[PDB]
Design a protein around this ligand. Structure first.
Ligand SMILES: [Mn+2]
Ligand SMILES: [Mn+2]
Lengths: 336, 60, 275, 322, 575, 290
C-alpha cells in the first residue's frame, strides 16, 4: 500500500494572498483535500497511508507519520500555521528520514544481496511550496542543499537521502495577486525553475508550476495519475546509437503485485568479496546501461523470470518508434 | 492558547469587569439553587449523541 | 471632511442574575455626529484651491480676458499625491483601462476609493483642479476607474425606480463624467451625458457609465494622446485624429437611452448631436 | 379555463366575455392539422376581440408568439409586401398588411431600447427573437416603404381613415427618429411625420387609436431642436449654434435670477466654450470669462464651491474683469 | 382525427410534462361533457381501461356519476376500475377500491348481482395477488342489497381468499374482515367467519396475526354474549402468548374495548391472567402498550370485585412497572396510574399509590414527571389537602424548579387547585416564593402561566393579600433593566386590574403604567398603550381624560409605527 | 389590511395555510417592505436572535412559546425557513406575515436554503405542489427570497448572519454594495455569505458542503477587529446543545430546530439579547405533537 507524504511549506512566505483572496497555505491545504478526493475516486486506494511533514523544527516537523489515523492527519492539516522559515533542505531530510527509518529494521533495502524490485515500499513526497528563497536564519541560500549532520544509522550505504521507491514531486504555487488573462493555460504544465526542481528530477519526479486554480486542478489530476507502485531505474546508453534525450532517463518501472512476487535481483554495482569489511555505497537508482545493438529474447519453459513494464518515457518512445518487438536491447549494470 | 481559565476554582481568573456576575454565578453553583464550547466538529455529532441517548420504542 | 462599574452594577442587581454574560463592552456610544457651517467650508476650500492655483499657474499682457496656463507638471504632482493619498496600493497603476470584468476583481479597493470620495468632498475639487491641466488627469486614471466601478456597482444594486433616492451617488456620477469631460478624456458628445442623469432609472445610467468605460478602454487616458499646441501653450487632445474618437459605437447606447425616455429627454437631444 | 377546453366548444369564447389565451394557443399550435388550424383561428378571433391594439399585445405577448400570430393573420388573408401597393387589395387584407408592417417597425424600434438584464427554452426563445430581429433588419426598408405607401393611399372592421394613418405615420416617425442617430438627414423626415401625427391627433380628437401623448410631445420637442427649421434652454442652444454668445451671456445673467436652467447644463456649455477657445477663436476668451463669472455667481447663490476656472481667471485681475 | 377530444386531445397531453398530465387527468370532466353520455361510455371508458396520474384518474372516476349518464349506466365504470385494481402499486389499489366502494351506492341490486359481483368473481379468482387484495377490500358494500343465494357465494369466496397461499392476500382479508363482519348476518358469522378467523389467527406469519388481532374486538362485539367463552376467547388466549412482540403489542392495545365486548364476567375470570402477563412481559413495547390501559381496564370492571382484581395482580405488577428499566414504559404508566385513586379508594390509596407517586415524581425522565403531575386533581379530590400537603407538597415544590419548562407549566396550572383548599397563611409561608419567582422565569410560557395564575390567586385570597404580597413584587419588575420583565409587569397589570377593583387599580397600578411610557424600548411603549386600553374601563373614570389621554397622545406621536398604531387603537377603544 | 393581516396571522398560528390570492397579496407586499431594507440591516437591541427553523412549524410554535410572541418579542431569524420540514409552507408564510404586519419587530434574513435549486431539491417545491397543486406559490416564495436581506447588524457589534465570512469580503461596505436581488450563485461573496461555516483551523478552507468556504479563529478575529464587531452570530450548522461558541467566543452558532430532520435528537436554543447586549440562551426541547 502506498505512502502519500505531504511536505507542506509552513514558511511565512506562504501567507501570500492570491486573486482568490486566500493565502498560499490555504491553497496548499485545499490542494491536499482535493488530491485526497481524487485519490479516493480510485477504488484501489482502500489502503493508503497519508503523512504530513512541515518546515518547523524536527521536534515539531513530523505532524503525522506512521501509526497516525486519518482523523489526526486531517486535524493537523487544518491547523497548520505558516510562521516559519523556508528550511527546505532540513525538511526534505526529515521527510526522507521518516520514509527510510524502517528500512533497516525490516530489511527492504536488501543490502549486499542484490537490488530486488519486488522489495519496495512505494512512497511519493508531494511538497507544496512557493518560489520564495530558502532561508536558514543567516541569509538566503539560492541553492538546495540537504544537510548531512546527524545521519541515521546506515545512511552511508546508499549515499543519497532518497531511495529506490521514492519520488519527490513539487507543487510550486505561483498564483499572482491579480488574475492574469490567459488562453494558453490549457496546455501542458511547465516545469518550475526553483531549487526544488533538480532535486525532484533526480528522484524520478518533477516540479509543477501552477499559476491558476484550473492549472492547480490539472496538476493535482496529473499527481493522482502518478501514484504508482514501482522503483526508479536510471537507464544509460552504453554503446553508440543503433546528445539525444533518450540517452539518460530516471524512468519508473512498474511492480505489479498479485504482495509482489519476483525471483531475480538487479545486480549490485560491485563484486562482493569477504575481504572488504565495509559494504560499498550504492546509488539509490541503479545505473543500468542498455546495449543499443539488437539481440534476441531468450526464454525457456517453466522459467522463473520477472517482467517489469516501464512507464512512458522518451526511452520507451524511442524503442517503440523503432518498431521491432521480435528483438531486444540487452541491459547490464557496470562494474558488476 | 491552552489557558483553560478555572474561574470557578481559581478566583484570580475572574476579570474585574464581570466580577459580580461571576460571583453570583459561583454562589448559585455552590448552593443548592466553558460548557457549549464544543470544538465544532463534535457539536453536530449525529451518531454519537443518539448512541449515548436511550433508544425509543418501535412502531406498530 | 467627515470626522465606577461595580458600584452601580451591584446596586442594579437563589437570586442569580438573569443574563448569562455580556456580548462586548455594553452598548456603543451614540455616534460622533458633528456639524460645520457650509459657507465656511466653501471659503476654506476656496482659499486652499486659490493657493493651489497660484502654485500651479505659470508665473508670467496676453489679452485682458485671458488666464495663465495651469502647469501640467504641477497638476501632475497634485494628481500623484491624490493617487497616493486615496488609493496608495496602486496595483492597477497602469494608465490604460482594464476590461469591465476587472471591476469585480477589485471591489474592496474601489469601494475604499468611493468611501474616501464620499467622506472628503475636497477630493472632487482637487480632481477639478487636476483636470484644468489636460495631461494631468491621465495620472488619476486609477482614481477615476475606481470611483466609476464603485458607482457602477451601486447602480447595479439600486432597486429604486429613479435615481434621486441616491443623491450622493447621482452627483458623484455627474461630477465624475464632468471631470473626465473637462480633462478631455471624453469627447464632448459623450461628455455631456451627466446632464440627463437625474432623469434616468439606475440601469440606464449604469449602461451609460459602462459605455464611458468602453470608450476609455478603446481610447485610454494616456499622456501621449495629448499634443502640445505651442501656439497657446496648452496640451490639446484631438479626438478626431484618434479614429472613432467622437463615440462611434459608444453613442449608440446614449441615443437608445434618449429614445427610450424621449417623453422626458426630448428637450435634451441638442446636447448629444453629432456636430 | 385551459387550452383543451377552448378548443372543444365553438361558442365558449363569447361566454368568456385573453392575452394568456393568445400565448397558450400559439404555444400549443407550434408544439412539435385541423386542430392547429382551429387553434390558430381561435387565437386570431381573440386577437381581433382586442380590436388589434398593438400596445397590449406588444407588452403582453413576446416577439416570436406575436410574429407567429401576425404571420397567421397574413396567411389567412392574402399571401412581396412592397409590391402589393395596397391599392386593389381588400380593406381587411390591406389593414392586416399595414398592421404587420406597423408591428415590425415598432419591434425594430423597440429592440434598440435598453432593458434591465436578468441577474441569473429561454435560450431557444432568445435565439428565435434574435433571428426574427435580424430578418426584420434585412427587411426594414421595405416595411418603411409599405407604411409610407399606406400613408399616401388614404382611399378608405372599418375604422377612421385618419386614425390608422395617424398611427402608421407615428410609427414611421419613431422609425425615422431611431434611424436618425446614424444619419442626421433622417431627422427631417422624422419631424415631418411627427408634425403630421400631431396635426392628425389635434384634428380628430378621438380616443378610440390610442397613442402616448407624452411621448409624442417629447418627440416634437426633440425634433424642434434637432431640426429647428422659446424656452431659455432652446434659446441658449440656438444662440450657441448661431454664435450669438452675448445673448447666451444675457440669458445666463437673467437665469441667475430665476435659477431655471440646470446647473450641469451651464457647466457643460462653459466647458464646451473653453474647449472652443483653447483651439482658436481668440475672441472667445472674453466670452469664456463672462460665462464663467455668471456660473460662479450662480454657484455662490446656491451655496456651492467656487470653480477652479474662476480662480484661474482672477490670477491676473483687470478693471474689465472686476 | 384532430378535433376528437378523447381520441386526440387526451392522447396528446399524455406526452407532456407530468404536471400537465395531472392537469389533463383532472380536467376529464370537460372532456366527458364534450362527448355524449353514450359517446363517453362507448369511447373514453374503453380507452381508460386500456403514480399520481393513476391516483388522479381513480379519484376522477370515483366522482364520475352523472358524466356517464347516471345510475343506469354506472356499471360501465367496472372494467377501468378493475384495470386500476390490478396495478402493482398499492395506493393506486386502495384508491381504486374506495372508488368502487363510493360508486357502489348508485347501483341497483339487480344491477349489483349482474355486474358488480362478477367483478368479485374475477378479482378473487385473479392470478395476481393484487386483484385478490382488491376483492378482499371490496366485499363490504355488495352484501346488504344482494340476495342470500349469492350472499353464500360471497361468504365462500371470502373464506377462499382468507385461505390464500400468498400472505398479503390473507393480510388484506383480515384487515377488512371487521368491516365485513359488521354487516354480515350474525347467524352466518358463527357458521362461516369465526373458524376461518381462527385459522388466520393461527397463521404462520406475524403480519397476518397482527390484523387477526386487529379485528378480534369487532368479532367479539358482534357475536352474542352467551358464546364468547368458546368462540372468540380461545383465539384471544392463543394470541395473548403469541411469539412475536408485534402481535402481543396489538393484543395489549385493544383491551379497553375487548373487555367491553366480551362481557365483564368473562373479563374478571379470563383477561386478568393475560393482562397480568402483559404487565410483566420481557420486552418494553407491549409492557408500555398494556400499561397505557391500566386505568381503562380497571374502571370497566364489576363493582363488587374491582378491588380484589387490582390488589391480587395489577398493583403488585405496578410496583415494578414504576421502577421499570425503560423510561418509555414508566411514562406510559405515569399518565394513567394516578387516576386509579377514585377507583381504588382513599383508605387504601395512602399506603400503596402514594409511595408510587413519590417514586414517579422524582424519575430522571421528564416525560414521567410531566405525565404524573397532570392528573393531580383526582388525588386532590379523593384524598384531601391535609394528606396531600403532608406527602406530595414537598415533592411538587421540589420539581417546580425543574429544568424542563412543561413540568413547571403543569405545576403553575395546578397551583389554583392547591390555593382552593389551603389557607392564606399556610400558602404565604409555603407557596409564594415560587409563585413570584415564576414571573422572572427564562421561558415566556412560564411567565404567562404565572401571570394568568395571579388572577386566580387574587380573586380567591383577597385584595389585601394582593397588596400585601403580589403588588410589591410586581412593582419590583417595573424598574428592572431587562425589557421582558417590564412586559411581564404590564401583563401583570392587565390581569390584575380586573381583580384588584377600581380604587386600588387607579391608585397603585395606574401611576406605574403612565411612568413607564417614556421607556426607550418600543416593545415596552406599545405595551403601555395596549395596557392603558385594557385597564381603561376598569380604572376610575374620573382619572381617564385627566391622565391617560395626554400620555396616549404622546405615545401616538412616537417614532415607531407599532407604538403609534397601538396608541391610536387605545385612543379609539378608550374614546 | 391590518385586520386582514392579523386574521391571517391568527389563522397561520394553527398551521392553516393561506390561499393563492393571500400568498399573492402577502408576498407582493413583503417585496415592497423588503426592498427598502439594506443588505446589512441595522437591528436595534433588544432582539431575540434565532437559528434555522427548517420548516418545523410546531417547533417554531415552541420557539414562540419560549421566547415570546411577536410583536412583544423582537425576533431575528437567520434563514433556512424551509426545506425538509413537514410544514415549510406554513412556516415561511407565517414568518413572512409577521414581517409584513410588524416590519420593525422582526427581521428575516436570507439563508442558503432560500435558493431556487435548493428548494427544488430538498422538498419545498414538492411541499408546494402537494399543498397547492400548481407551482406558482413556490416561485412566488423564491421571488420573495430574492428580496431578503443578507446580513444583520445589532448595535454595530453583533454581526448576525446565516453562513460565515468570505475570502472576497473584508468589510461590511462590501456586503452593503452586494447586489442581493439575485439567485444565490454557486460561487462568490454572496454564496460565501450564505453557505460558509467556521472550523477549528488555521485559515480558509473549502467547505464540505460544496458551496462556500470554511474559516478559522484568525479569520474571525481579523474580520471582527477590521469592522469594529464583538461577535458574529451564525445559524447554518447543526448544534446538539442548541448553541455553541467558537473561535474564543467570537462566533456563536445557534440552531433553532429541535430534533432536526425529526431524527437528529438535538436540543435547540435561541439567543436573547438584552437592552445592553446582555445575552441569554434559552435551550428548548422539541414540542410534543398530538
Ligand atoms: Mn440549514
Ligand atoms: Mn443553512
Amino acid at each position: 500500500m502506498p505512502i502519500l507524504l505531504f511536505l507542506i511549506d509552513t514558511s511565512a512566505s506562504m501567507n501570500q494572498r492570491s486573486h482568490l483572496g486566500t493565502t498560499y497555505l490555504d491553497t496548499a491545504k485545499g490542494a491536499v483535500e482535493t488530491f485526497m478526493k481524487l485519490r479516493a475516486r480510485d477504488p484501489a486506494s482502500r489502503g493508503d497511508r497519508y503523512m504530513l511533514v512541515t518546515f518547523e523544527e524536527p521536534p515539531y516537523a513530523i505532524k503525522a507519520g506512521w501509526k497516525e489515523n486519518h482523523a489526526t492527519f486531517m486535524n493537523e492539516l487544518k491547523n497548520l500555521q505558516a510562521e516559519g522559515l523556508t528550511t527546505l533542505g532540513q525538511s526534505l531530510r526529515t521527510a526522507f528520514d521518516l520514509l527510510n527509518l524502517n528500512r533497516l529494521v525490516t530489511g527492504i533495502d536488501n543490502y549486499g544481496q542484490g537490488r530486488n524490485p519486488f522489495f519496495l515500499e512505494p512512497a511519493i513526497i508531494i511538497t507544496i511550496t512557493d518560489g520564495s528563497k530558502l532561508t536558514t536564519t543567516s541569509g538566503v541560500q539560492d541553492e538546495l542543499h540537504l544537510p548531512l549532520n546527524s545521519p541515521l544509522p546506515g545512511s552511508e550505504l546508499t549515499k543519497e537521502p532518497f531511495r529506490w521507491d521514492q519520488r519527490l514531486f513539487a507543487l510550486v504555487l505561483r498564483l499572482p495577486g491579480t488574475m492574469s488573462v490567459e488562453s494558453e493555460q490549457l496546455t501542458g504544465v511547465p516545469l518550475d525553475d526553483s531549487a526544488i526542481t533538480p532535486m525532484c528530477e533526480v528522484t524520478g519526479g518533477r516540479s509543477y508550476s501552477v499559476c491558476s486554480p484550473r492549472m492547480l486542478n490539472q496538476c493535482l489530476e496529473s499527481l493522482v495519475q502518478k501514484v504508482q507502485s514501482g522503483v526508479v531505474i536510471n537507464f544509460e546508453k552504453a554503446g553508440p546509437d543503433p546528445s539525444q534525450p533518450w540517452h539518460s532517463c530516471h524512468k519508473l518501472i512498474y511492480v505489479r503485485p498479485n504482495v509482489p512476487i519476483g525471483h531475480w535481483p538487479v545486480p549490485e554495482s560491485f563484486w562482493p568479496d569477504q575481504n572488504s569489511p565495509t559494504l560499498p555505497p550504492r546509488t539509490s537508482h541503479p545505473v543500468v546501461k542498455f546495449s543499443c545493438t539488437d539481440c534476441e529474447p531468450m526464454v525457456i519453459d517453466k522459467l522463473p523470470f520477472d517482467k517489469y513494464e516501464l512507464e512512458p518515457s522518451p526511452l520507451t518512445q524511442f524503442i517503440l518508434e523503432r518498431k521491432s518487438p521480435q528483438t531486444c536491447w540487452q541491459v547490464y549494470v557496470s562494474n558488476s | 492558547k491552552d489557558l483553560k481559565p478555572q474561574t470557578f476554582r481559581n478566583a484570580y481568573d475572574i476579570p474585574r469587569r464581570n466580577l459580580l456576575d461571576h460571583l453570583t454565578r459561583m454562589r448559585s453553583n455552590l448552593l443548592k439553587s466553558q460548557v457549549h464550547s464544543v470544538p465544532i466538529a463534535q457539536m453536530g455529532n449525529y451518531q454519537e449523541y443518539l448512541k449515548q441517548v436511550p433508544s425509543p420504542l418501535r412502531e406498530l | 471632511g467627515q470626522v465606577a462599574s461595580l458600584l452601580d452594577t451591584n446596586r442594579r442587581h437563589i437570586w442569580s442574575v438573569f443574563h448569562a454574560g455580556v456580548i462586548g463592552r455594553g452598548l456603543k456610544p451614540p455616534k460622533f455626529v458633528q456639524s460645520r457651517n457650509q459657507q465656511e467650508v466653501i471659503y476654506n476650500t476656496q482659499s486652499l484651491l486659490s493657493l493651489l492655483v497660484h502654485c500651479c499657474s505659470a508665473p508670467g499682457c496676453g489679452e485682458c480676458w485671458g488666464a495663465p496656463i495651469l502647469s501640467p507638471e504641477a497638476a501632475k504632482a497634485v494628481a500623484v499625491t491624490l493617487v497616493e493619498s486615496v488609493c496608495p496600493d496602486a496595483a492597477g497603476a497602469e494608465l490604460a483601462w482594464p476590461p469591465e470584468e476587472h471591476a469585480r476583481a477589485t471591489v474592496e479597493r474601489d469601494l475604499r476609493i468611493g468611501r474616501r470620495f464620499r467622506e472628503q468632498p475636497l477630493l472632487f475639487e482637487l480632481l477639478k483642479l487636476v483636470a484644468a491641466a489636460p495631461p494631468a488627469l491621465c495620472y488619476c486614471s486609477v482614481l477615476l476607474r475606481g470611483l466609476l466601478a464603485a458607482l457602477l456597482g451601486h447602480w447595479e444594486a439600486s432597486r429604486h425606480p429613479d435615481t434621486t433616492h441616491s443623491p450622493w451617488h447621482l452627483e458623484a456620477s455627474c461630477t465624475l463624467v464632468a471631470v473626465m469631460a473637462e480633462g478631455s478624456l471624453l469627447p464632448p458628445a459623450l461628455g455631456n451625458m451627466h446632464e440627463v442623469f437625474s432623469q434616468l432609472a439606475p440601469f440606464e445610467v449604469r449602461l451609460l457609465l459602462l459605455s464611458v468605460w468602453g470608450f476609455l478602454r478603446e481610447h485610454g487616458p494616456l499622456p501621449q494622446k495629448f499634443i502640445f499646441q505651442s501656439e497657446r501653450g496648452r496640451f490639446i487632445r484631438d479626438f478626431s485624429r484618434e479614429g472613432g474618437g467622437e463615440g462611434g459605437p459608444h453613442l449608440a447606447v446614449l441615443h437608445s437611452v434618449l429614445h427610450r425616455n424621449i417623453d422626458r429627454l426630448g428637450l435634451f437631444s441638442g446636447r448629444f448631436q453629432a456636430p | 379555463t385551459c387550452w383543451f377546453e377552448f378548443l372543444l366548444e365553438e361558442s365558449l369564447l363569447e361566454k368568456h366575455l385573453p392575452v394568456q389565451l393568445i400565448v397558450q394557443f400559439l404555444e400549443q399550435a407550434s408544439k412539435p392539422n385541423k386542430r392547429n388550424r382551429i387553434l390558430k383561428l381561435l387565437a386570431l378571433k381573440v386577437a381581433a376581440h382586442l380590436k388589434w391594439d398593438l400596445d397590449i399585445l406588444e407588452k403582453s405577448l413576446s416577439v416570436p408568439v406575436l410574429n407567429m400570430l401576425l404571420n397567421e393573420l397574413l396567411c389567412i388573408s392574402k399571401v412581396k409586401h412592397v409590391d402589393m401597393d395596397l391599392a386593389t387589395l381588400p380593406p381587411t387584407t390591406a389593414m392586416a398588411v399595414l398592421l404587420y408592417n406597423r408591428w415590425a417597425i415598432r419591434t425594430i424600434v423597440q429592440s434598440s431600447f435598453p432593458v434591465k438584464q436578468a441577474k441569473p427554452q429561454m435560450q431557444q426563445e432568445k435565439e428565435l427573437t434574435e433571428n426574427i430581429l435580424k430578418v426584420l433588419k434585412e427587411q426594414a426598408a421595405d416595411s418603411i416603404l409599405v407604411l409610407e405607401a399606406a400613408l399616401k393611399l388614404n382611399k378608405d372592421l372599418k375604422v377612421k381613415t385618419e386614425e390608422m394613418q395617424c398611427q402608421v405615420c407615428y410609427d414611421l416617425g419613431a422609425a425615422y427618429f431611431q434611424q436618425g442617430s446614424t444619419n442626421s438627414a433622417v431627422y427631417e423626415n422624422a419631424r415631418e411625420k411627427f408634425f403630421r401625427t400631431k396635426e392628425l391627433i389635434a384634428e380628430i380628437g378621438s380616443l378610440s387609436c390610442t397613442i402616448d401623448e407624452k411621448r409624442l410631445a417629447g418627440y416634437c420637442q426633440a425634433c424642434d431642436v434637432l431640426v429647428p427649421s422659446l424656452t431659455p434652454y432652446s434659446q441658449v442652444h440656438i444662440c450657441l449654434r448661431s454664435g450669438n454668445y452675448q445673448e447666451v451671456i444675457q440669458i445666463f445673467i437673467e437665469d441667475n435670477l430665476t435659477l431655471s436652467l440646470p446647473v450641469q447644463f451651464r457647466q457643460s456649455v462653459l466647458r464646451e466654450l473653453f474647449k472652443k477657445a483653447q483651439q482658436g477663436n481668440e475672441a472667445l476668451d472674453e466670452i469664456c470669462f463672462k460665462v464663467c463669472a455668471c456660473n460662479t455667481v450662480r454657484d455662490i447663490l446656491e451655496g456651492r464651491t467656487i470653480s477652479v476656472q474662476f480662480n484661474q481667471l482672477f490670477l491676473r485681475p483687470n478693471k474689465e474683469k472686476i | 382525427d384532430s378535433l376528437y377530444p378523447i381520441a386526440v386531445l387526451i392522447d396528446e397531453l399524455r406526452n407532456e410534462d407530468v404536471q400537465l398530465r395531472l392537469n389533463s387527468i383532472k380536467k376529464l370532466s370537460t372532456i366527458a361533457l364534450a362527448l355524449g353520455v353514450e359517446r363517453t361510455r362507448s369511447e373514453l371508458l374503453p380507452f381508460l381501461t386500456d403514480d399520481e396520474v393513476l391516483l388522479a384518474l381513480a379519484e376522477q372516476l370515483g366522482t364520475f356519476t352523472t358524466l356517464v349518464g347516471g345510475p343506469e349506466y354506472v356499471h360501465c365504470l367496472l372494467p377501468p376500475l378493475e384495470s386500476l385494481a390490478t396495478v402493482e402499486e398499492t395506493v393506486v389499489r386502495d384508491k381504486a377500491v374506495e372508488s368502487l366502494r363510493a360508486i357502489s351506492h348508485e347501483h341497483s341490486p339487480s344491477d349489483l348481482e349482474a355486474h358488480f359481483v362478477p367483478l368479485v368473481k374475477r378479482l378473487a379468482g385473479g392470478d395476481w395477488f393484487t386483484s385478490r387484495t382488491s376483492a378482499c377490500g371490496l366485499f363490504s358494500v355488495c352484501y346488504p342489497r344482494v340476495s342470500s343465494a349469492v350472499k353464500a357465494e360471497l361468504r365462500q369466496y371470502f373464506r377462499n381468499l382468507c385461505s390464500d397461499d400468498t400472505p398479503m392476500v390473507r393480510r388484506a382479508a383480515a384487515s377488512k374482515l371487521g368491516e365485513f363482519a359488521k354487516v354480515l348476518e350474525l347467524d352466518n358469522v358463527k357458521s362461516e367467519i369465526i373458524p376461518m378467523f381462527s385459522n388466520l389467527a393461527s397463521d404462520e406469519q406475524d403480519s397476518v396475526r397482527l390484523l387477526a388481532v386487529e379485528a378480534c374486538v369487532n368479532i367479539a362485539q358482534l357475536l352474542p354474549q352467551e358464546d364468547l367463552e368458546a368462540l372468540v376467547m380461545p383465539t384471544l388466549r392463543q394470541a395473548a402468548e403469541d411469539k412475536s412482540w408485534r402481535v402481543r403489542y396489538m393484543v395489549a392495545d385493544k383491551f379497553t374495548e375487548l373487555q367491553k365486548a366480551v362481557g365483564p364476567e368473562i373479563t374478571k375470570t379470563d383477561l386478568v391472567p393475560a393482562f397480568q402477563n402483559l404487565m410483566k412481559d420481557c420486552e418494553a413495547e407491549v409492557r408500555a402498550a398494556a400499561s397505557h390501559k391500566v386505568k381503562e381496564f380497571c374502571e370497566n370492571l364489576s363493582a363488587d370485585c374491582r378491588e380484589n382484581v387490582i390488589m391480587s395482580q395489577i398493583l403488585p405488577c405496578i410496583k415494578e412497572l414504576v421502577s421499570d428499566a425503560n423510561q418509555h414504559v414508566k411514562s406510559a404508566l405515569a399518565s394513567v396510574i394516578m387516576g386509579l385513586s377514585p377507583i381504588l379508594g382513599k383508605d387504601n390509596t395512602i399506603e400503596h399509590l402514594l409511595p408510587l407517586f413519590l417514586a414517579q415524581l422524582k424519575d430522571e425522565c421528564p416525560e414521567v414527571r410531566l405525565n404524573i403531575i397532570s392528573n393531580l386533581d383526582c388525588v386532590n379530590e379523593v384524598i384531601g389537602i391535609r394528606q396531600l400537603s403532608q406527602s406530595l407538597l414537598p415533592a411538587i415544590v421540589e420539581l417546580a424548579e425543574d429544568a424542563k419548562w412543561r413540568v413547571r407549566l403543569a405545576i403553575i396550572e395546578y397551583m389554583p387547585l392547591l390555593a382552593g383548599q389551603l389557607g392564606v397563611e399556610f400558602f404565604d409561608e409555603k407557596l409564594n416564593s415560587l409563585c413570584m419567582a415564576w414571573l422572572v422565569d427564562h421561558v415566556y410560557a412560564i411567565r404567562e402561566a404565572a401571570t394568568s395564575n395571579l388572577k386566580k390567586l387574587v380573586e380567591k385570597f383577597g385584595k389585601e393579600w394582593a397588596h400585601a404580597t403580589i403588588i410589591p413584587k410586581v412593582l419590583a419588575m417595573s424598574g428592572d433593566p431587562n425589557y421582558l420583565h417590564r412586559m411581564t409587569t404590564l401583563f401583570c397589570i392587565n390581569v390584575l386590574s380586573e381583580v384588584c377593583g377600581q380604587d386600588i387599580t387607579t391608585k397603585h397600578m395606574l401611576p406605574t403604567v403612565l411612568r413607564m411610557a417614556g421607556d426607550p424600548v418600543a416593545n415596552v411603549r406599545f405595551n403601555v398603550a395596549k395596557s392603558l386600553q385594557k385597564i381603561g374601563p376598569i380604572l376610575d373614570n374620573s382619572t381617564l381624560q385627566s391622565e391617560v389621554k395626554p400620555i396616549l397622545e404622546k405615545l401616538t406621536q412616537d417614532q415607531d409605527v407599532d407604538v403609534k398604531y397601538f396608541a391610536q387603537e387605545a385612543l379609539t377603544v378608550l374614546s | 389590511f391590518t385586520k386582514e393581516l392579523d386574521q391571517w396571522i391568527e389563522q397561520l398560528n394553527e398551521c392553516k395555510q393561506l390561499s393563492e390570492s393571500q400568498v399573492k397579496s402577502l408576498c407582493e407586499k413583503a417585496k415592497e417592505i423588503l426592498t427598502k431594507e439594506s443588505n446589512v440591516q441595522e437591528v436595534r437591541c433588544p432582539v431575540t436572535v434565532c437559528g434555522d427553523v427548517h420548516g418545523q412549524f410546531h417547533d417554531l410554535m415552541e420557539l414562540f412559546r419560549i421566547g415570546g410572541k411577536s410583536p412583544d418579542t423582537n425576533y431575528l431569524f437567520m434563514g433556512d425557513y424551509v426545506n425538509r420540514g413537514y410544514y415549510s409552507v406554513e412556516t415561511v408564510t407565517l414568518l413572512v406575515a409577521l414581517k409584513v404586519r410588524y416590519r420593525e419587530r422582526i427581521t428575516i434574513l436570507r439563508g442558503n436554503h432560500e435558493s431556487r435549486q435548493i428548494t427544488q431539491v430538498y422538498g419545498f417545491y414538492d411541499e408546494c405542489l402537494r399543498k397547492y397543486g400548481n407551482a406558482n406559490v413556490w416561485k412566488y416564495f423564491t421571488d420573495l427570497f430574492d428580496y431578503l436581506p443578507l446580513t444583520a447588524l445589532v448595535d454595530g457589534q453583533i454581526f448576525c448572519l446565516h453562513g460565515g465570512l468570505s475570502p472576497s469580503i473584508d468589510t461590511l461596505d462590501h456586503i452593503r454594495a452586494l447586489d442581493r436581488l439575485q439567485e444565490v450563485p454557486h460561487e462568490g461573496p454572496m454564496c460565501d455569505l450564505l453557505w460558509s461555516d467556521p472550523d477549528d483551523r488555521g485559515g480558509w478552507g473549502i467547505s464540505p458542503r460544496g458551496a462556500g468556504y470554511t474559516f478559522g479563529q484568525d479569520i474571525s478575529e481579523t474580520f471582527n477587529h477590521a469592522n469594529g464587531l464583538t461577535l458574529v452570530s451564525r445559524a447554518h450548522q447543526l448544534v446538539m446543545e442548541g448553541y455553541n461558541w467558537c473561535h474564543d467566543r467570537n462566533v456563536v452558532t445557534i440552531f433553532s430546530a429541535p430534533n432536526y430532520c425529526y431524527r437528529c435528537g438535538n436540543q435547540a436554543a435561541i439567543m436573547e439579547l438584552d437592552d445592553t447586549l446582555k445575552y441569554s440562551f434559552l435551550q428548548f426541547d422539541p414540542a410534543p405533537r398530538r
